[PDB]
Design a protein around this ligand. Structure first.
Ligand SMILES: O=C(O)c1ccccc1Nc1cccc(C(F)(F)F)c1
Length: 193
């Protein structure tokens, strides 16, 4: 599972609507050495290397997506849950060739449902930089070219307890493209050193 004692990812998805199309989808464990990816994110140092030093290390995950790009409103939907009532800050950074080019900061209040608290961030509009980027990527004539382009782009999500500023979840994403026959796919990994 992608999660800690305090906070779990229930569902994640990114999509376009005119019946929607999902680029990637997680509905709800191998490891990887964070040193192998230090370079994919800034040495900002709000990038990965510094965050990991201050831990906790069990809070840090890597997701590799093989996206489905064969298909307007662009959106992202996240759902988390916990047994504690919290307020969350969710920070998402896009990084391109080592440099942070987007930062999006959102908060969500716990909601009571079925004996647990859920934190629903639903249909957030995907930022414009990403929509435009996806429209170009969609044009490329060959899957191997898309992957070459995508090798230089990563996303980092940082979820903290807003009232204590404790990190609860830190997730790095990296991306390739799948063929239409093989649909979207993901693999989740703990990060270690
Ligand atoms: O959608 C935005 O505006 C977004 C902005 C900054 C950082 C991440 C963002 N969204 C996001 C976050 C995680 C994964 C994906 C996607 F999977 F769509 F690429 C998109």
């Amino acid at each position: 599972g992608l999660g800690t004692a305090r906070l779990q990812l229930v569902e994640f998805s990114a999509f376009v609507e005119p019946q929607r199309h999902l680029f990637v989808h997680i509905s709800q464990l191998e490891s990887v050495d964070v040193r192998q990816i230090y370079d994919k994110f800034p040495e900002k140092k709000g990038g990965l290397r510094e965050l990991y030093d201050r831990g906790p290390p069990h809070a840090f995950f890597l997701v590799k997506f093989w996206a489905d790009l064969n298909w307007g409103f662009y959106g992202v939907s996240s759902q988390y849950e916990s047994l504690e009532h919290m307020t969350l800050t969710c920070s998402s950074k896009v990084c391109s060739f080592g440099k942070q080019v987007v930062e999006k900061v959102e908060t969500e209040r716990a909601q009571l449902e079925d004996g647990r608290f859920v934190y629903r961030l639903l249909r957030s509009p995907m930022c414009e930089y990403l929509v435009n980027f996806l429209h170009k990527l969609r044009q490329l004539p060959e899957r191997y070219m898309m992957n070459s382009v995508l090798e230089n782009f990563t996303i980092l999500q940082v979820v903290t307890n807003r009232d204590t500023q404790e990190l609860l979840l830190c997730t790095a994403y990296v991306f390739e493209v799948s063929t239409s026959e093989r649909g979207a796919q993901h693999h989740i990994y703990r990060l270690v050193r």
